[PDB]
Write an enzyme that holds these catalytic residues in place. Structure first.
Site, mmCIF file in Angstrom:
data_model
loop_
_atom_site.group_PDB
_atom_site.id
_atom_site.type_symbol
_atom_site.label_atom_id
_atom_site.label_comp_id
_atom_site.label_asym_id
_atom_site.label_seq_id
_atom_site.Cartn_x
_atom_site.Cartn_y
_atom_site.Cartn_z
ATOM 1 N N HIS A 279 0.605 -1.169 -0.261
ATOM 2 C CA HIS A 279 0.014 -0.104 -0.061
ATOM 3 C C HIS A 279 0.801 1.199 -0.351
ATOM 4 O O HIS A 279 1.893 1.385 0.521
ATOM 5 C CB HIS A 279 -1.510 0.087 1.384
ATOM 6 C CG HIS A 279 0.037 0.045 2.543
ATOM 7 N ND1 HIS A 279 0.144 1.278 3.133
ATOM 8 C CD2 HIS A 279 0.085 -0.954 3.463
ATOM 9 C CE1 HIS A 279 0.775 0.716 4.160
ATOM 10 N NE2 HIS A 279 1.074 0.172 4.883
ATOM 11 N N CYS A 297 3.206 -5.016 7.020
ATOM 12 C CA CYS A 297 2.921 -4.505 5.399
ATOM 13 C C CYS A 297 3.982 -3.624 4.521
ATOM 14 O O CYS A 297 4.830 -3.334 5.505
ATOM 15 C CB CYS A 297 1.704 -3.884 5.371
ATOM 16 S SG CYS A 297 -0.296 -4.271 5.988
#
Ligand SMILES: *Sc1cc(Cl)c(Cl)cc1C(=O)NCCO
Length: 350
Positions: A279, A297
């Site tokens: 992301h 992440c």
């Protein structure tokens, strides 16, 4: 020669399964009349063969019904009539299957067939028996259960681009254990597209995207910090979001706890059910390519995260290597390739 009648059901039978049509056959004669009604007197749709020899139901039979079948045969020898009554299965429960990927989709080389039931399956073998997977070119594959409700099917190696895959989940009328029967059948078909493999190497802090073997993008990344590291292993790409709120409570982690979080991010591509995404992370661009700062992440720049969103599809692969983390669980939901083939091939139907 008196005509003979042969029905696919026995007069007085109970527990008759509705996974197959009911037929009546005449020998040494032809069928002059065949009717079948349910317990409300409703006629059941059927069809007689042009030669007059074979009659068969043409619509699904119902659960928990009593049917009455009448048939007359005629021939130079004479005539014969039979009346048969039978009851179909009465399920204690129904379960509906859901199949991924979606019908008509083009997916990446890591996409397993997925059959998810909305109830626990007591007889996994009956479920597997009821699922027919066709592949062109044909390839060996096998079933493996991620949990009590969802089974997966895949080959030993990533799919070959261009492979056609057809999935028929024929669970209607099938006893899936403990009185659970299939609520319906499902039928889907998909095709394998281009090979897309992205590798995140902790030694370089670069996420490199390869399409058909060629490097097409090199993305500085910041992965999980040492206390919350990114797991090594093979991840399957799942869903895509232009923007999404990342909320730790989704995973039992209170937002106000040490490892909690609740933040809105852009251009997020899911790669694990445990919540790992690629992301946009404007706040870590200085660390990207140098140091790990996240909760797990793969932080990349806004432009690289949008490029990933635009150029990677469901079933493409992200492989993470050389982190201080463990290995992504094979039963994560998108971690199927981390199960060794011999273990996957042997299955776990019990
Ligand atoms: S994917 C993600 C994104 C953001 Cl901005 C935060 Cl603060 C946390 C996470 C996250 O760690 N999700 C769970 C997988 O580690």
């Amino acid at each position: 020669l008196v005509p003979k009648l042969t029905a696919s059901v026995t007069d007085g039978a109970v527990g008759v399964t509705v996974d197959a049509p009911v037929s009546v056959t005449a020998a040494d004669g032809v069928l002059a009349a065949v009717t079948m009604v349910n317990d409300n007197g409703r006629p059941v749709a059927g069809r007689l063969s042009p030669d007059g020899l074979r009659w068969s139901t043409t619509e699904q039979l119902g659960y928990n019904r009593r049917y009455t079948l009448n048939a007359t045969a005629l021939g130079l020898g004479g005539a014969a009539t039979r009346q048969l009554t039978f009851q179909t299965s009465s399920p204690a429960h129904l379960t509906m299957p859901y199949v991924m990927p979606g019908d008509g989709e083009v997916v990446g080389v890591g996409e397993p067939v997925a059959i998810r039931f909305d109830e626990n399956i007591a007889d996994r073998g009956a479920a597997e028996k009821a699922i027919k997977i066709t592949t062109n070119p044909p390839v060996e594959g096998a079933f493996y259960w991620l949990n009590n409700r969802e089974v997966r099917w895949r080959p030993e190696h990533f799919w070959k681009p261009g492979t056609a895959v057809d999935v028929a989940v024929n669970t209607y009328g099938v006893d899936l254990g403990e009185g659970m029967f299939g609520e319906d059948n499902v039928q889907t078909h998909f095709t394998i597209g281009d090979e897309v493999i992205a590798t995140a190497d902790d030694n370089t802090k670069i996420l490199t995207v390869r399409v058909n073997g060629e490097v097409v993008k090199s993305m500085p990344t910041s992965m999980g910090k040492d206390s919350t590291p990114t797991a090594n292993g093979i991840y399957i790409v799942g869903s895509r979001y232009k923007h999404i709120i990342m909320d730790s409570s989704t995973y039992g982690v209170p937002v106000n706890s040490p490892n909690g979080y609740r933040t809105d991010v852009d251009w997020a591509t899911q790669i694990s059910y445990s919540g790992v995404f690629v992301h946009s992370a404007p706040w870590s661009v200085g660390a990207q390519g140098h140091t790990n700062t996240s909760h797990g992440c793969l932080n990349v720049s806004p432009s690289n995260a949008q490029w990933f969103y635009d150029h990677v599809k469901r079933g493409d692969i992200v492989e993470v290597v050389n982190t201080v983390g463990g290995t992504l669980p094979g039963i994560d939901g998108l971690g199927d390739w981390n199960i060794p083939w011999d273990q996957w091939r042997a299955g776990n139907a019990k």
